[PDB]
Design a protein around this ligand. Structure first.
Ligand code: CL
Ligand code: CL
Lengths: 194, 194
């Protein structure tokens, strides 16, 4: 049963959705592919290897806003990128955990390099351009991991009603906007005292 | 060998540091406590139960800045709280993952209720006071999970030198300051167009 790299990964992504990050094993993947374990091992040595491949493909398939447009503002870049990252992570079960668990890839540095060039051309130091992107990343990952994880007193109750209703999109977008404005302030200040 | 709730949890925290969140099992905890598995089961029914207990204790022991001081500014509250949360999570291996994986506790709502009362007294709606605290939380969790997880092109290189050197404290504190300023802007705007 076809053991092309593409086909292994695809069967693995399907499996990820059935069983989650814990449950997913090479033993279960071979059963799925209709193939003996030593035959799969020839192709995929371990779970670590499999997960790395998965982490790269999820972004390859869904993370479509990774490079800025022509003449785009840094603010809009960071907003579109984070929106894109977020939906790429929400696409598969435990998707955020798959991303957390893997060292970055030899395309992810090339794309991040254009991203960081873009930031330095817009007034960001380099450490600062790196930080700004890290922070948006951290914020988005944290927001997704709590959304993907989770399926008394009066005030907590009373503000619940937007905890449910919306999936987390409004809360996420409000906070992303807050974070980008804060990074603006620091940037434009240069520094007089801010 | 003493099976007090306190003593079980403490042995579990030690074990958490040895084996991490995956490795930790009830079977391994019983071996540690010098006790047969059915004897442990009387006290702790499953891993889910154990992890819940651990998640609450880590914050009970280390999260010391969970309530504002007398006359404290909302900004300073959010900054001290997040600093405190962060160090509480960095204290045990996979500490951030233990927190992610558990529904909140019947003290965590009472303390969050005072926190949210505090925010509404400082001009925050309620949904907004809740969001502000959620976002700081998300940012801190994301920052910690990437620090606890992780133990080519020219610009990426050249800004690495503060990736190492510091542990993540400077980056974290710069971004927390950015995020709080952004939340200020939105708050003080009320809204004229911001
Ligand atoms: Cl075939
Ligand atoms: Cl004893």
């Amino acid at each position: 049963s076809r053991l092309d790299k593409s086909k292994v990964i695809n069967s693995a992504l399907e499996l990820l959705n059935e069983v989650g990050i814990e449950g997913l094993t090479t033993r279960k993947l071979a059963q799925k592919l209709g193939v003996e374990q030593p035959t799969l091992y020839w192709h995929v040595k371990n779970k670590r290897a499999l997960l790395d491949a998965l982490a790269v493909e999820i972004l390859a398939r869904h993370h479509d806003y990774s490079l800025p447009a022509a003449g785009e503002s840094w603010q809009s870049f960071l907003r579109n990128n984070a929106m894109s990252f977020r939906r790429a992570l929400l696409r598969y079960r435990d998707g955020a955990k798959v991303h957390l668990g893997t060292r970055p890839d030899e395309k992810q540095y090339d794309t991040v390099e254009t991203q960081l060039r873009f930031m330095t051309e817009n007034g960001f130091s380099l450490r600062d351009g790196l930080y700004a992107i890290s922070w948006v990343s951290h914020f988005t990952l944290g927001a997704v991991l709590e959304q993907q994880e989770h399926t008394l007193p009066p005030l907590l109750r009373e503000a619940l009603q937007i905890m449910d209703s919306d999936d987390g999109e409004q809360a996420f977008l409000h906070g992303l906007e807050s974070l980008i404005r804060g990074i603006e302030v620091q940037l434009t200040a240069l520094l007089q005292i801010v």
